[PDB]
RNA sequence: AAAUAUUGGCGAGAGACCGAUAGCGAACAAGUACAGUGAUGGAAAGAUGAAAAGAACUUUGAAAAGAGAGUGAAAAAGUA
RNA sequence: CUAGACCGUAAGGUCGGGUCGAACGGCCUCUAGUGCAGAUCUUGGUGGUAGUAGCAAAUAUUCAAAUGAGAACUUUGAAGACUGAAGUGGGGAAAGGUUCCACGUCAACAGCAGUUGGACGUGGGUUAGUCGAUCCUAAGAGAUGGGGAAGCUCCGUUUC
RNA sequence: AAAAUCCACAGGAAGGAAUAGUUUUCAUGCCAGGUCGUACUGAUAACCGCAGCAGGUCUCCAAGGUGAACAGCCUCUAGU
RNA sequence: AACCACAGCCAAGGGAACGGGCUUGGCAGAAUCAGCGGGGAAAGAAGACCCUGUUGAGCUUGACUCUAGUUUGACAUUGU
RNA sequence: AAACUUUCAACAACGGAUCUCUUGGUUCUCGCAUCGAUGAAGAACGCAGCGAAAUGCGAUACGUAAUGUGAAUUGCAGAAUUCCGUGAAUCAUCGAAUCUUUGAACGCACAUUGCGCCCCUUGGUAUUCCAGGGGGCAUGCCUGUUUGAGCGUCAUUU
């Protein structure tokens, strides 16, 4: 997930199982004030939902990940 | 330590909403820190603080609704008493005590008397 | 080949999980649970099956609401709150 | 089946999280009598019948 | 208890299986399957003349 | 209404009852593990010591472990 | 536990010695789920058989190095072979459910072995407007209206 | 097979005029496209047969030679 | 793993009328290996044939006793 | 003579009998009357700093509020002006709440985490499209309300 962060402009999130791609897009925009280009979602083999949230070219994923706190 | 509900009750709705958002942010930041720190005990304190704020908010909204429906028929069913299905089915004390005028006349005329076998 | 070579054809399923009781007794073609009798309104039960009744009866689960009824009874189904503040 | 229902995958995810030995510190608790994970399941030994 | 030793659907296997004719628990997969039942000589069976 | 019933529920008090192959199937994560497509079927499994004081340390061994040393009233109590 | 002792025809009783660790007897009476060699007896444990029968279908292995405590079996190289495209190849559908992959690692399991493994321990991994489901109807299934049925329910699928 | 679904035609309801009144199944332009599945085996060891059982279990692709040939035999890719 | 009362050399006798054991003789020397099918009335199963049981079941029919259905009559529905 | 077989004893095994123990069962007696559409019993899934289960709970998730008590919890880690205190605790009590997905289970459906409609509201240029948030939409039956049907039927009237 992290190599995706500094290579694909992608933030990888565990999100609610009740969240759809619209809600994930809206939440990321509100919690992190970044603009979202695309969201891909999958249900992991442990029952949680993983969201691949790619940002627009105008935002970096490293700086946002740093601002959130990890890496 | 967490929040105290008796402190929270002296706050307005906007203040409780603001504290609730602040605590949710705190939990989100702490769940990020849990990724690197092997153990995090502060999570539980903030989680219970969120429950305490939501509890107080709910108590204030429910109380204000009770005031809205004060002393009028047809309360909301959630604000009615939750005794038991059969107990809520039972005749009221008024209905149970109802008698015919004929029975009431007999009860007045010939009540059970107090007496003793002594003399 | 009624035995071992016929046992290699067992790859369909007659029953799957029942919505009501989670039993894998929901007969797929009859759309009936052979355990609980879903979707019939009543729960399937029999007096000749005393053990089955024991397996699914009241008290073998959580009793999410019944577990507190005797306490509320013992307090008279009171309403309100406790009065004082502290010692 | 590789094209499954969500209900089956959900049950498989629960079984995946259950698949583990006993946590070691449980044996150290006062008055512990739990020796191991008596409900340990394995895909080769006992099928889970959906 | 009047049901002690009898909460079982055990039946005899009859002759020709090289075992005694005591009724036996059916099914499989649990170690109790195939064992004797209902008898005063049987483990987990019913006592002779249960006390009333 | 009461006097009557009550192998269920809740709350109590008891026994010339059983004492872990007994006593409920179940004293224990027991209607559990497990079998069966399914209805259903359905176990086994209690006890170190007063206290882990659950054997530091040396030595042989690749290691398990052994031999010492030691703890303990007792290791002829070492979680086999 | 005890080819140590004594009493009783006997059922049995008593004593010494060892082991052991928390309760138990004599006598007078009361009571019973009260005495086992057998029941192809029940449950559990254990033998002889016996280091025995065997571990012989699918053509087949070999040299060296590396690893390791340990190599017929792990890895790499070399070599000899085979499947011979209706395959011992490359994907899938039912089914399984993490077996996939990585690190660690060998008590148990892989009816020899094992440093290897579908094993054990800990993690990682499944990204869709266009691929599927989802929509359609098929043989069928089945509510409603309504009629049967003591009833559980049954009939029927456009009917009055 | 059926149905969903798409189109066409017949019909002519209604609507439409100034510098382009309208209309545009022509072109270009803007936005969005949710949910669940997706790893791997698919079998002389991942399925069923008590198991790591010579059994059973649907299907797609298919090289050169010999030869009538998807026969038998030998070979290349791949695999063991 | 089957199997196993205890076991394992014969001859004859008697014996529940075919003995490894009992009686009288023959004899008889540790421990064993490969093979073998005479014997162990070898093992595999409370003979499936037969008979008995006041034990069944499948099937048949003019058995005994009934029965679904169906037919016939009467009453009711049922009036003018 | 050894080995071997057999018997006995000692020590060591194998195995788990015996004895002693018992937060369990069984039987008797006494007292009480309290599930559910205000959504039960039951089911699925999830929730802890480190839990697989049992138990507890429901996204407020081994719990929140209240009340009492009066300093714990504990296997480690952590915290411990709050410890002469509106106050620790996996404490007791419990009257306020929360109560995922379901289930008689109720928008329709359900081997689907499938598919609609109505109201409010927010965002995307938006009564119409898409999306977010909140609230609704089952059946039988009763009382009432309103809107209707029938030359069933009564009066009325150029
Ligand atoms: Mg998805
Ligand atoms: Mg997807
Ligand atoms: Mg919490
Ligand atoms: Mg066969
Ligand atoms: Mg057959
Ligand atoms: Mg079928
Ligand atoms: Mg599903
Ligand atoms: Mg018993
Ligand atoms: Mg028992
Ligand atoms: Mg001692
Ligand atoms: Mg001893
Ligand atoms: Mg001891
Ligand atoms: Mg002796
Ligand atoms: Mg003691
Ligand atoms: Mg007896
Ligand atoms: Mg005996
Ligand atoms: Mg005897
Ligand atoms: Mg051999
Ligand atoms: Mg070849
Ligand atoms: Mg060949
Ligand atoms: Mg594949
Ligand atoms: Mg694994
Ligand atoms: Mg081996
Ligand atoms: Mg080995
Ligand atoms: Mg490896
Ligand atoms: Mg692998
Ligand atoms: Mg894929
Ligand atoms: Mg794939
Ligand atoms: Mg099976
Ligand atoms: Mg040619
Ligand atoms: Mg004998
Ligand atoms: Mg003898
Ligand atoms: Mg003989
Ligand atoms: Mg003699
Ligand atoms: Mg002689
Ligand atoms: Mg012979
Ligand atoms: Mg016979
Ligand atoms: Mg016979
Ligand atoms: Mg006779
Ligand atoms: Mg027959
Ligand atoms: Mg509810
Ligand atoms: Mg508590």
From Swiss-Prot, chain A:
Annotated Gene Ontology cellular components are: cytosol; cytosolic large ribosomal subunit; preribosome, large subunit precursor
Q: Which UniProt keywords apply?
A: Cytoplasm, Isopeptide bond, Ribonucleoprotein, Ribosomal protein, RNA-binding, rRNA-binding, Ubl conjugation
GO-annotated molecular function: RNA binding; rRNA binding; structural constituent of ribosome
Q: List S-S links within the chain.
A: none
Which cellular compartments is it found in?
Answer: Cytoplasm
Q: Which domain of life is it from?
A: Eukaryota
Oxidoreductase as a keyword? no
Which BP terms does GO give this entry? cytoplasmic translation; ribosomal large subunit assembly
**Any idea what job this protein has?**
Component of the ribosome, a large ribonucleoprotein complex responsible for the synthesis of proteins in the cell. The small ribosomal subunit (SSU) binds messenger RNAs (mRNAs) and translates the encoded message by selecting cognate aminoacyl-transfer RNA (tRNA) molecules. The large subunit (LSU) contains the ribosomal catalytic site termed the peptidyl transferase center (PTC), which catalyzes the formation of peptide bonds, thereby polymerizing the amino acids delivered by tRNAs into a polypeptide chain.
Write out the similarity annotation. Belongs to the universal ribosomal protein uL23 family.
Q: What is this protein called?
A: Large ribosomal subunit protein uL23
Taxonomic source organism: Saccharomyces cerevisiae (strain ATCC 204508 / S288c) (Baker's yeast)
**Annotated gene:** RPL25
Swiss-Prot record, chain B:
GO process terms (BP):
cytoplasmic translation; maturation of LSU-rRNA from tricistronic rRNA transcript (SSU-rRNA, 5.8S rRNA, LSU-rRNA)
Localisation: Cytoplasm
Would the keyword Ribonucleoprotein turn up in this protein's UniProt record?
Answer: yes
MF terms per GO, please? mRNA binding; structural constituent of ribosome
InterPro entries associated with the record: Ribosomal_uL29, Ribosomal_uL29_CS, Ribosomal_uL29_euk, Ribosomal_uL29_sf
UniProtKB keywords: Cytoplasm, Phosphoprotein, Ribonucleoprotein, Ribosomal protein
Location of Phosphoserine modifications: 12, 49
Q: Which domain of life is it from?
A: Eukaryota
Q: Which Gene3D superfamilies match?
A: 1.10.287.310, 6.10.250.3450
> Which is one Gene Ontology cellular component term of this protein?
cytosolic large ribosomal subunit
Determine if Metal-binding is one of this entry's keywords. Answer: no
Main location (coarse class)? cytoplasm
Subunit comment: Component of the large ribosomal subunit (LSU). Mature yeast ribosomes consist of a small (40S) and a large (60S) subunit. The 40S small subunit contains 1 molecule of ribosomal RNA (18S rRNA) and 33 different proteins (encoded by 57 genes). The large 60S subunit contains 3 rRNA molecules (25S, 5.8S and 5S rRNA) and 46 different proteins (encoded by 81 genes). uL29 is associated with the polypeptide exit tunnel.
What more the UniProt record tells us is: There are 2 genes for uL29 in yeast.
* HAMAP family the UniProt entry points to: Ribosomal_uL29
> Which family is this protein grouped under?
Belongs to the universal ribosomal protein uL29 family.
Q: What is this protein called?
A: Large ribosomal subunit protein uL29A
From Swiss-Prot, chain C:
- Spell out the Pfam families in the cross-references: Ribosomal_L37e
Taxonomic superkingdom: Eukaryota
Sections of the chain in a coiled coil: none
Q: What is the lineage of its organism?
A: Eukaryota, Fungi, Dikarya, Ascomycota, Saccharomycotina
A GO MF annotation of the entry reads: zinc ion binding
Cross-referenced InterPro entries: Ribosomal_eL37, Ribosomal_eL37/eL43, Ribosomal_eL37_CS, Ribosomal_zn-bd
User: How is this protein organized at the quaternary level?
Assistant: Component of the large ribosomal subunit (LSU). Mature yeast ribosomes consist of a small (40S) and a large (60S) subunit. The 40S small subunit contains 1 molecule of ribosomal RNA (18S rRNA) and 33 different proteins (encoded by 57 genes). The large 60S subunit contains 3 rRNA molecules (25S, 5.8S and 5S rRNA) and 46 different proteins (encoded by 81 genes).
Family of the protein in this entry: Belongs to the eukaryotic ribosomal protein eL37 family.
UniProt name for this protein: Large ribosomal subunit protein eL37A
Which gene carries the instructions for this protein? RPL37A
**Principal cellular location given in the protein's record:** cytoplasm
A single Gene Ontology biological process assigned to it is:
cleavage in ITS2 between 5.8S rRNA and LSU-rRNA of tricistronic rRNA transcript (SSU-rRNA, 5.8S rRNA, LSU-rRNA)
From Swiss-Prot, chain D:
Any one GO cellular component localisation term in the record: cytosol
- Read off the InterPro entries from this record: Ribosomal_eL39, Ribosomal_eL39_CS, Ribosomal_eL39_dom_sf
Q: Where in the cell is it found?
A: Cytoplasm
From the UniProt record, which GO molecular function terms apply? Answer: structural constituent of ribosome
Basic residues bias spans: 6-19
Output the GO biological process annotations, alphabetical, semicolon-separated: cytoplasmic translation
Residues covered by region (Disordered): 1-21
Q: Which Gene3D superfamilies does its entry note?
A: Ribosomal protein L39e
What UniProt keywords are attached to this protein's entry?
Cytoplasm, Ribonucleoprotein, Ribosomal protein
| Domain of life according to the entry | Eukaryota
Q: What is its main location?
A: cytoplasm
Q: Which family does it belong to?
A: Belongs to the eukaryotic ribosomal protein eL39 family.
Described function: Component of the ribosome, a large ribonucleoprotein complex responsible for the synthesis of proteins in the cell. The small ribosomal subunit (SSU) binds messenger RNAs (mRNAs) and translates the encoded message by selecting cognate aminoacyl-transfer RNA (tRNA) molecules. The large subunit (LSU) contains the ribosomal catalytic site termed the peptidyl transferase center (PTC), which catalyzes the formation of peptide bonds, thereby polymerizing the amino acids delivered by tRNAs into a polypeptide chain.
- Subunit details for this protein? Component of the large ribosomal subunit (LSU). Mature yeast ribosomes consist of a small (40S) and a large (60S) subunit. The 40S small subunit contains 1 molecule of ribosomal RNA (18S rRNA) and 33 different proteins (encoded by 57 genes). The large 60S subunit contains 3 rRNA molecules (25S, 5.8S and 5S rRNA) and 46 different proteins (encoded by 81 genes). eL39 interacts with YIH1.
Q: What is the protein name stated in its UniProt record?
A: Large ribosomal subunit protein eL39
Q: Which gene encodes it?
A: RPL39
């Amino acid at each position: 997930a992290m190599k995706k962060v500094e290579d694909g402009n992608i933030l990888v999130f565990q999100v609610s199982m009740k969240a759809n791609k619209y809600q994930i897009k809206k939440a990321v925009k509100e919690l992190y004030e970044v603009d979202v280009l695309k969201v891909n979602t999958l249900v992991r083999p442990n029952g949680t939902k993983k969201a691949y949230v790619r940002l627009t070219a105008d935002y970096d994923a490293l700086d946002i990940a740093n601002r959130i706190g990890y890496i | 330590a967490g929040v105290k509900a008796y402190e929270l009750r002296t706050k307005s709705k906007e203040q409780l909403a603001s504290q609730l958002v602040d605590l949710k942010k705190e939990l989100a930041e702490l769940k990020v820190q849990k990724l690197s720190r092997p153990s995090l005990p502060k999570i539980k304190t903030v989680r219970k603080s969120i429950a305490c704020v939501l509890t107080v908010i709910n108590e204030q909204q429910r109380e204000a609704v009770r005031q809205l429906y004060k002393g009028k028929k047809y309360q909301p069913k959630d604000l009615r008493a939750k005794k038991t299905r059969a107990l809520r089915r039972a005749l009221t004390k008024f209905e149970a005590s109802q008698v015919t005028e004929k029975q009431r006349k007999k009860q007045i005329a010939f009540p059970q008397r107090k007496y003793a076998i002594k003399a | 080949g009624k035995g071992t070579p016929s046992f290699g054809k067992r790859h369909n399923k007659s029953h799957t999980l029942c919505n009501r009781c989670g039993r894998r007794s929901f007969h797929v073609q009859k759309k009936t649970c052979s355990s609980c009798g879903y979707p019939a309104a009543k729960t399937r039960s029999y007096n000749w099956g005393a053990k089955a009744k024991r397996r699914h009866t009241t008290g073998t689960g959580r009793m999410r609401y019944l577990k507190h009824v005797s306490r509320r009874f013992k307090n008279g189904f009171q309403t309100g709150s406790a009065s004082k503040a502290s010692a | 089946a590789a094209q499954k229902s969500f209900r089956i995958k959900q049950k498989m995810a629960k079984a995946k999280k259950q698949n583990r030995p006993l946590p070691q510190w449980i044996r150290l608790r006062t008055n512990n009598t739990i020796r191991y994970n008596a409900k340990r399941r394995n895909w080769r030994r006992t099928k889970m019948n959906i | 208890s009047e049901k002690a030793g009898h909460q079982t659907s055990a039946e005899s296997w009859g002759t020709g299986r090289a075992v005694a004719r005591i009724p036996r628990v059916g099914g499989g997969g649990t170690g109790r399957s195939g064992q004797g039942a209902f008898g005063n000589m049987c483990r987990g069976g019913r006592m002779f003349a249960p006390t009333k």
